[model samples]
Target: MQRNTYNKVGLYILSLAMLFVFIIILTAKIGLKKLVLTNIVPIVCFVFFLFSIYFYNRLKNITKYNGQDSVKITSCQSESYESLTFLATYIVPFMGFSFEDMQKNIAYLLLVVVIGIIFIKTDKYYANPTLALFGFKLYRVNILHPGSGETKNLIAISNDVLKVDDNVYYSFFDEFVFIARKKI
Candidate 1:
């Protein structure tokens, strides 16, 4: 299939999966108190989970601004990918996929391994991979592909930034990218 088609399909499938999980969590087999207690951990985790997404999205937007026309080159003491994997991997398990659920046990285990592998590989891209999560800010700046050098070393968000708004403000020592405009 075409790449865009594949992505659309993948996204649709993910959306459906998320919806299915939401429905599962909303299932009420007992009284409200028991239900709340049983699901509280997952529920609170989910709320923080959403905040993490919000921050990451804001980070993406902060870097993707102004098309490459406004690319600025700046230097920091260091760069790493540790925080990215941390924030991303740390939350997936809590997002409603129960490790003990019979229907999800095997699938969840496989998913954990897959995420584990991804985390490991991506981890090496940083100087101090595992310890980078302690970074107060994160970024994911894109090193422009070979064809585009103007955007070379452009400051996208690193794995060290956090979000302040839904998709507007990302917290980094430097400014976020796409808050104001689309990348043309």
Candidate 2:
């Protein structure tokens, strides 16, 4: 895959957005300082920061490219894998609280994690396959791989989509590449 400046900038924007959300939560007047500080705020902040760095590097690497270019792939798979169960099991245990308190913490933490992922993952693209180039967004679609006659669960920004020719493409940050796919 050729370098794509849009992908880098877009991800960087998303990372900043995530950081901003955390900042607001931390600074909010809700008087939940202990909750925010003790819960998943740091974990989510670190995740967002890590993603920002990841996208910044990608943007730097993809210093040049035609916006109209598309990536070619043999086959690809996509899915929304939620780590809530694992998070609840591992992270919740460490919180050290009663059942009711645990539920409250988990609820707020889960909400933040979900919203953060959505923002960081799906901030770019307009929608429709053809319109995505200019500004289009697809709510739902099936990615049919001609080579393997296979289909994978696909959404606007998920993995079961375009198979890029280049190995260096950012799997998490290249939604734009798939948006540019002719088959979409």
Candidate 3:
């Protein structure tokens, strides 16, 4: 569960890679001794972006919990727009990222730090574009608890197509999100 928590944060970071990548491209005026420092900042972002891809994908191979809940998958509707929602809400505002001035750079960096905290604290992790890009889908899942025979609606993560009415094994990723699969 804690691992998934971190992966959720990783997904959030992974989404920011696009902004960093674009910023790296606009970094002109190459050729000087200070060139090393210029390259270092963006290159570091690249390295972290690559690792976040690896880190986030680790969620797919996680070991099933000992006592996974079994639930009937009633309706699994794809919630892909969360990615676009993220782009519009978070990334678009910072589209003007520039290190041309220290103050501008600091402002963008500060924006990221503030937004990052709010993102992780809330359920905005579902809005990661990286997750959508990697085929890890977010689902608004309608589930029927086998034991209680109660209908519950919640968000779930899965890489494959979830079948309607499948008696699936599920594990709680957190209080709000679940990971569901057909076979353990």
Candidate 4:
């Protein structure tokens, strides 16, 4: 619902994380490990998997400090509905539904296709309810920076209320938004 980058495509998979893990482990009783090792491709693929995990953290560690300074909260507001809309859009429709019907499947499939594009084009893609479940909160914080008090509108994520004139340090997620983690 907000136009911002840093959109997480992982919202699709991450929301499925615990449920996905449960299925992955529960079904392993059918000798899936032996089944996979029976294939030559998977043996080497397992070696590559370790390297991929190592490099994945390398990607996450990119959230480094660029520079930061005292930014007084000129204004702050809580952003709640996008995450709710994401849960309503992506989750609620499947309950009590029959996936066995192909006609409704394609019809609703096209509906989701249409909306996923809107999620991308309008930058609502990171409105992931799972991120909210994990304690991330969305906020629009107007900050007064010092090019002798130059002010810019900013959207940020934080855990609590930051009132007007409250002071903190920040690093940008984009030119228009930030999180307070990198500043002291």
Q: In model 4, how large is the Cα lDDT of residue 42?
A: 33
Best by lDDT: 3
Q: What is the TM-score of each candidate against the true structure?
A: 0.30, 0.29, 0.72, 0.54
Per-residue accuracy of model 3 over 26-105 as CA lDDT, tens digit each: 65446566887666656666776677667655654552543544445565666655546667777667554436765576
Tell me the lDDT of model 2 at 33.
Answer: 63
Candidate lDDT (C-alpha), each: 0.38, 0.42, 0.66, 0.51
For candidate 1, lDDT tens digit of each residue in 34-72? 778765535643664465455455445654544433433
Least accurate stretch of 10 residues (summed lDDT) in model 3? 63-72
1-184: candidate 4 lDDT, tens digit per residue: 2423323333333443433333333333235767774443334334434444444343245334334433444555666565476767666665435444446656755765576666756767556666566556776766776555755555676534465555654544454555553234
Give the residue spans of candidate 3 off by over 4 A.
Answer: 1-5, 28-33, 63-85, 128-130, 144-151, 169-171
Q: For model 2, what is the alpha-carbon lDDT of residue 128? A: 19
- Which residue window of length 10 is worst by lDDT in model 2? 125-134
Per-residue lDDT over 67-153 for candidate 2, one digit per residue giving the tens place of the 0 to 100 score: 433333343433433334433433344344433354585685675556444544564322212222223333333443455453343
In model 2, pairs of residues that clash are 1-166, 73-163, 77-160, 78-160, 126-136, 126-137, 127-136, 127-137, 127-138, 128-137
TM-score winner:
3
Question: Model 4, residue 150: displacement in angstroms?
Answer: 4.6
User: How many collisions between residues are there in candidate 3?
Assistant: 0
Ranking by lDDT: 3, 4, 2, 1
Clashes of each: 18, 10, 0, 0
